[PDB]
Design a protein around this ligand. Structure first.
Ligand SMILES: O=C(O)c1[nH]c(=O)[nH]c(=O)c1F
Ligand SMILES: O=C(O)c1[nH]c(=O)[nH]c(=O)c1F
Ligand SMILES: [Zn+2]
Ligand SMILES: [Zn+2]
Ligand SMILES: [Zn+2]
Ligand SMILES: [Zn+2]
Lengths: 363, 363
């Protein structure tokens, strides 16, 4: 028998359009999403041009409307120059993304004062998410407290980080977080197989103790999100390997395997890939939308999944139990057993739906 | 006419004994202190052995009692192994020092969870100070809030850091800080003259804008403290230059010059080199103790000051106006015009004085 799930949401993907379309584009990346049982994605702003101003957002919105096969929201990115300039378009974005560790120059913040300025100027009712590793988690939490608002921490990867967040939650601080599949299912032990190029990712793969700590502290994890970060094999295996793994097509199969093994429950999964993404990011329901999965079928992850242009995967060789069989999106069959059946452009910007605007107090 | 000042206190010095006595020892370092108008010093724990346990503290206490010419308190240092082990000796120390950025392996903390453990286990009534640069300031402030206590930030060197602290103080958070003379009187502009070896210090020399920001935000600075960090010229000019400047003998002359120029008042100076050190660290008064300075005498800083074994100074060539003429410590003439007149061992551990114990609620 098939199990019917609601439309799953991935709040952290890199779809590379504009400007990196050999790595992925809206059409290929959203095909990958649907194949992974994901019907709504939130796309990060570190494209070329990066989504750091109104014109870049407008361009990305049209590229997404024309290419996306599933529904989406687009993040804006914080820069050293745009604090206090995004007020008119802020509500149209998934949220604001801060890159607080490594990134390219356009998104680099050189001072915590710049973080403060963003927390002070970004509308208080809208989401802020951060790439914030190790001590940077504590630092951005401090900025959030000084400015008396919430923050969501992207891809938590370490015992250190999840325990800090746990302590913050115990103090009633408004912080949420997500964890990516590679930080639950891969570790340092896998670097021998992957090699130093393929294995490059930020946050880096953790120790066995890091992975164990994330599982032990599942209660502290609000969301799963792939951090789908496609690069071609040539790039990953070259002289200056970019960090990141593709992950849309493998996330749900990996997690379903863990459900099958009793490592977490189906509800635990659905809180983290549906309900909590909805509530943290104020994402609307999708009418007539559901995913049918098969929990019995055992298979081995191949050297590349069918859809991502990355055309490789760090999970090659892992045995999984769990398969996406069918996806229906807003009343149309979007995916069946390896075939995507909705065209580029079927997808819509959920922030334009009346139910997808973030509620706020009147002026 | 001479101006009579109270006995000045430097809460941040490295006296290198035990184990680095070619760089400085208690006798030479405290001679330097007296020559700089300083009658009480707090010595950092990054010696060899480092002061991270009771036996090392006991050794350092005896070396200081035998060698110090001025009065002192000794810091304990946080390590990855000693949280929850220092309770019996904590009250005998100046406070607990956390090295949160670069340091040697024995004092390295690999996780913010280790910082949390120290804040939770160190007695709540006793001082904690941190080497915490840039975002690390925000991170350690977060740990302090989670554990609902105060923290003092060592050598604030950047616009970013002083503005973060300013914002924290505006929110009523219990944080204090100190600034070292090199971050007020030297900058990037001086690296050409100093060279890359001599110029090595942590925190590094800041931009002109950093220096300007510290002066503009003098109200936010609770203490001046030298971070006297002596290394020999051979070491500074060698293949792996250690970071740090000697500074006991130049701190007061530099600051008196600024007082003379109306950059801050004499009271501003005395709050920062006497009253605030006393109150933050619960340091006792010194009976019959005072410093007489001459504010008229103009001189140029030489290539080395008379007492520090570092035998060099990054302030060489700077013109100053202000000289220490005489120091009286506990009723004895300790220094006159270049001559130290109290022997090694004259100095005492102020934490052993009845008035130098930190008051606490009964068990
Ligand atoms: O865009 C990427 O490739 C990327 N890859 C990573 O591994 N971490 C990131 O923070 C990131 F932005
Ligand atoms: O002990 C030292 O030499 C030293 N020198 C520095 O410049 N910064 C430090 O944090 C330090 F511990
Ligand atoms: Zn990231
Ligand atoms: Zn990412
Ligand atoms: Zn330091
Ligand atoms: Zn120091």
């Amino acid at each position: 028998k098939l199990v019917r799930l609601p439309g799953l949401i991935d709040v952290h993907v890199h779809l590379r359009e504009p400007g990196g379309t050999h790595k992925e584009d809206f059409a290929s990346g959203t095909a990958a999403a649907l194949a992974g049982g994901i019907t709504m994605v939130c796309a990060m702003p570190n494209t070329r041009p990066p989504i750091i101003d109104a014109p870049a957002l407008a361009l990305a919105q049209k590229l997404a409307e024309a290419g996306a096969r599933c529904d989406f929201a687009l993040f804006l990115g914080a820069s050293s120059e745009n604090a206090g300039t995004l007020g008119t378009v802020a509500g149209s974005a998934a949220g604001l993304k801060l890159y607080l560790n490594e990134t390219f120059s356009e998104l680099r913040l050189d001072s915590v004062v710049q973080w403060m300025e963003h927390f002070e100027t970004w509308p208080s009712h809208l989401p802020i998410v951060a790439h914030a590793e190790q001590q940077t988690v504590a630092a951005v939490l401090m900025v959030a407290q000084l400015t008396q608002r919430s923050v969501h921490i992207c891809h938590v990867a370490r015992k250190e980080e999840i325990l800090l967040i746990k302590a913050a939650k115990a103090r009633g601080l408004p912080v949420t977080c997500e964890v990516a599949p590679h930080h639950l299912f891969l570790s340092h032990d896998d670097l021998e197989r992957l090699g130093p190029g393929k294995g490059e990712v930020r946050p880096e793969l953790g120790s066995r103790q890091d992975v164990e700590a994330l599982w032990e502290n599942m209660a502290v994890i609000d969301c799963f999100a792939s951090d789908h970060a496609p690069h071609t094999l040539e790039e990953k295996c070259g002289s200056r390997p970019p960090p990141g793994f593709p992950g849309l097509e493998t996330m749900l199969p990996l997690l379903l395997t863990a459900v099958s093994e009793g490592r977490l429950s189906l509800d635990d999964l659905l809180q983290r890939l549906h309900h909590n993404p909805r509530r943290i990011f104020h994402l609307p329901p999708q009418e007539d939308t559901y995913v049918e999965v098969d929990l019995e079928h055992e298979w081995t992850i191949p050297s590349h999944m069918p859809f991502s242009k990355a055309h490789w995967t760090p999970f090659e060789g892992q045995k999984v139990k769990g398969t996406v069989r069918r996806v229906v999106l807003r009343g149309e069959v979007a995916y069946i057993d390896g075939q995507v059946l909705v065209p580029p452009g079927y997808g819509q910007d959920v922030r334009k739906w009346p139910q997808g605007a973030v509620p706020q107090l009147p002026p």
